[PDB]
């Protein structure tokens, strides 16, 4: 009886592949070959934050593109003012093994989580200003890998087990649960329209979810190894995935297949962080070989290298206005990079 | 306006206070030693923790030295992702039940995978070959996992290094040293890294594990410091 189910499933996968192949009438490189190259991108560091004393996993820019939070394995969550390098806040975490952090769009709350399977939300604005645990959300089985504030009262998280959860911070239990992945979900990203979000797991596939009704809308299986970072295009109709293949790939929801591949022969290490610029033309990818690369998204050609980190680049972020690019690494340093005219 | 100066000096005061707090925390952070207690499934991890929610942390002080021990309780069997978080720990205490399926082979594969990790190549491993008394009984009764599973045990002899264990059957010593030799051959394979292996036939609930772990951590720290001074 099961063999019939397997045959039906493989027939459906074959027909989906055939539909995708028939949909492919051209190639992104073929159409973009007549576009002026971006050219060499000389980015230099402007600020260096030297407060953390342990390797750093996560960071998130503020809505004002000035305040940024950072999470380090000594159980520390530091909120910096990037303009003046001053430390606005320093929060000691109960669990020293942090793997993700988020900064609320309103700026009043900060998310944190890790191997304790508990998402801690900290209230920055209190009657005295002292930071305290606003609420702990529990219920995930695997390690909390990523978390993003959907709203001041809603937060979406991904766990070590194959499960994402949209919570209600007011009441503290999962409002919706998204399941269907095969491996550990490593990264998360929220679409600009706030209606959808993509999740990349360790099964070499990325799934698109809608927070309203809560089931997978599309699945992309272009990669061939664990996916470590995902991020929507600023348009909201595409996203990029970084994997252990030493390859970054671009997917489109409407096309529902590959668009462009960002592989290079000299690159052997995997990708740990992927982010876009404000216009989306530049794709900044953090690599394990102590460096960071800038790719022309429409040409798949390297445009610059953000060298200067003494360890692997674990986290990368781009400001909302696209004024500077922050990169954190395991050498307990955050470097902010900018271009010069 | 005078305001800009007011918030600027307030920011300076807050930054200096936070810097003082960070230095105070840095002292404690550098004082404590972090250890990751992994294991080969059932190997006696719970009994060892009792003798000495995601992750469990145990704080114990020996000889005025503080040790935090982290055990991954509520985690999935796929370790290829969250194990990278423990690259900078002082040591990984790997407990192996030397006594269903071939547990020894799975433990050997896990140890080889940990040893050959690109992020864990600088992290030392302390081997706890537990259940030595259980292994003794197995060998004495005839139950074998050393010859039955590994046909090279017939063409094996007890190494002439040492035998600190007191009066015991030569077969039991040969078996335990064969297992230790398999682990050591896995560890000392050709490669690179600043890590070292510390095998131990513990099977001890008399707080001897405290002394063993403390001595191993002392050795690891001394070797790292000497390597900083390129004395070896």
């Amino acid at each position: 009886e099961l063999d019939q189910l397997r045959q039906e499933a493989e027939q459906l996968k074959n027909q989906i592949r055939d539909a995708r192949k028939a949909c492919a009438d051209a190639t992104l490189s073929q159409i973009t070959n007549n576009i002026d190259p971006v050219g060499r991108i000389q980015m230099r560091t402007r600020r260096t934050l030297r407060g953390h004393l342990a390797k750093i996993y996560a960071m998130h820019w503020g809505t004002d593109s000035r305040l940024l939070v950072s999470a380090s394995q000594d159980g520390k969550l530091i909120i910096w003012d990037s303009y003046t390098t001053n430390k606005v806040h320093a929060i000691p975490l109960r669990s020293s093994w942090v793997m993700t952090c988020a900064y609320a769009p309103s700026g009043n709350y900060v998310a944190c989580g890790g191997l304790d399977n508990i998402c801690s939300i900290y209230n920055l604005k209190t009657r005295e200003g002292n930071v305290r645990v606003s609420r702990e959300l529990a219920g995930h089985t695997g390690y909390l890998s990523c978390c993003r504030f959907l709203d001041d009262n809603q937060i979406v998280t991904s766990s070590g087990d194959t499960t994402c959860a949209l919570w209600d911070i007011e009441t503290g239990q999962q409002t919706t649960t998204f399941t269907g992945h095969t491996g550990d979900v490593m990264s998360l990203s929220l679409a600009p329209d706030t209606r959808l979000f993509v999740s990349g797991a360790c099964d070499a596939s990325a799934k698109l979810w809608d927070v309203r009704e809560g089931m997978c809308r599309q699945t992309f299986t272009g990669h061939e190894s664990d996916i470590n970072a995902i991020c929507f295009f600023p348009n909201g109709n595409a996203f990029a995935t970084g994997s252990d293949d030493a390859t970054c790939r671009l997917f489109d929801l409407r096309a529902d297949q590959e668009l462009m591949t960002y592989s290079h022969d000299n690159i052997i290490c995997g990708i740990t962080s992927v982010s876009f610029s404000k216009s989306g033309r530049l794709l900044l990818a953090g690599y394990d070989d102590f460096n960071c690369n800038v790719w022309d998204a429409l040409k798949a050609d390297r445009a610059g290298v953000l060298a200067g980190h003494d360890n692997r680049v674990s986290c990368l972020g781009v400001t909302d206005d696209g004024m500077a690019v922050a990169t954190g690494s395991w050498d307990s340093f955050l470097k902010i990079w900018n271009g010069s005219s | 306006t005078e305001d800009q100066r007011n918030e600027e000096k307030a920011q300076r005061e807050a930054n200096k206070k936070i810097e003082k707090q960070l230095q105070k925390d840095k002292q404690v952070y550098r004082a404590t030693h972090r250890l990751l207690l992994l294991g080969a499934g059932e190997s006696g991890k719970n009994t060892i923790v009792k003798q000495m929610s995601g992750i469990f942390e145990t704080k114990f002080q020996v000889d005025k030295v503080n040790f935090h021990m982290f055990d991954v309780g509520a985690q999935r069997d796929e370790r290829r992702k969250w194990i990278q978080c423990f690259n900078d720990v002082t040591a990984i205490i790997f407990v192996v039940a030397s006594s269903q399926t071939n547990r020894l082979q799975a433990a050997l594969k896990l140890f080889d995978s940990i040893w050959n990790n690109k992020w864990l190549r600088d992290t030392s491993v302390i081997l706890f070959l537990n259940k030595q008394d259980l292994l003794a009984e197995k060998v004495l009764a005839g139950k074998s996992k050393i010859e039955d599973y590994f046909p090279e045990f017939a063409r094996y002899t007890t190494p002439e290094d040492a035998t600190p264990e007191p009066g015991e059957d030569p077969r039991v010593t040969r078996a335990k040293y064969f297992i230790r030799d398999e682990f050591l051959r896995i560890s000392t394979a050709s490669g690179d890294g600043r890590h070292y292996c510390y095998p131990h036939f513990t099977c001890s609930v008399d707080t001897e594990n405290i002394r063993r772990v403390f001595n191993d951590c002392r050795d690891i720290i001394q070797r790292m410091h000497l390597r900083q001074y390129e004395l070896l």
């Epitope: 095969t182 491996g183 360790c202 099964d203 070499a204 061939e224 190894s225 664990d226 252990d244 293949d245 052997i268 995997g270 | 069997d77 796929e78 370790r79 290829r80 194990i83 799975a106 594969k109 896990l110 080889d112 995978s113 940990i114 050959n116 990790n117 690109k118 490669g191």
Partner: nanobody, 127 residues
Framework: QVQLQESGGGLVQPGGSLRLSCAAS????????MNWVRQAPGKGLEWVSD????????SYTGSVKGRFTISRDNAKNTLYLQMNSLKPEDTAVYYC?????????????????????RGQGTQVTVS
């Protein structure tokens, strides 16, 4: 997308010879270390053999060494496992697995309950 599909097996008498063929059509075969694992009808997953990217490094779980031979062919992007002199304890399901990281001497979660990069099943029985 990896699509690790293997074949072979069946009902054989003890002391027979079987040849399991495994094919991958979702990645570059030569870049990954390959292996075979075995799941008994009443037991859990158990790694049985492994071969490196080029074939220089080959290792076995024991009690099957000399009896089992593993060999990959990069031109056909396939792999073969030749087993001889079957005992009435090898009746189980054999999985042709590729562990995740390429160009790496390490790979951790081949023998996991819910591995993603493991192929389908193939029953072989001896009696």
């Amino acid at each position: 997308q990896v699509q690790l599909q293997e074949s072979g097996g069946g009902l054989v008498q003890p002391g027979g010879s079987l040849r399991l063929s495994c094919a991958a059509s979702g990645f570059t075969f030569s870049n990954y270390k390959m292996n075979w694992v075995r799941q008994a009808p009443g037991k859990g997953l158990e790694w049985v053999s492994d071969i490196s990217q080029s074939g220089a490094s080959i290792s076995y779980t024991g009690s099957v060494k000399g009896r089992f031979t593993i060999s990959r062919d990069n031109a056909k992007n396939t792999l073969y496992l030749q087993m001889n002199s079957l005992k009435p304890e090898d009746t189980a399901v054999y999985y042709c697995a590729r562990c995740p990281a390429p160009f790496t001497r390490d790979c951790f979660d081949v023998t996991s309950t819910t591995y993603a990069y493991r192929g389908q099943g193939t029953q072989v029985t001896v009696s």
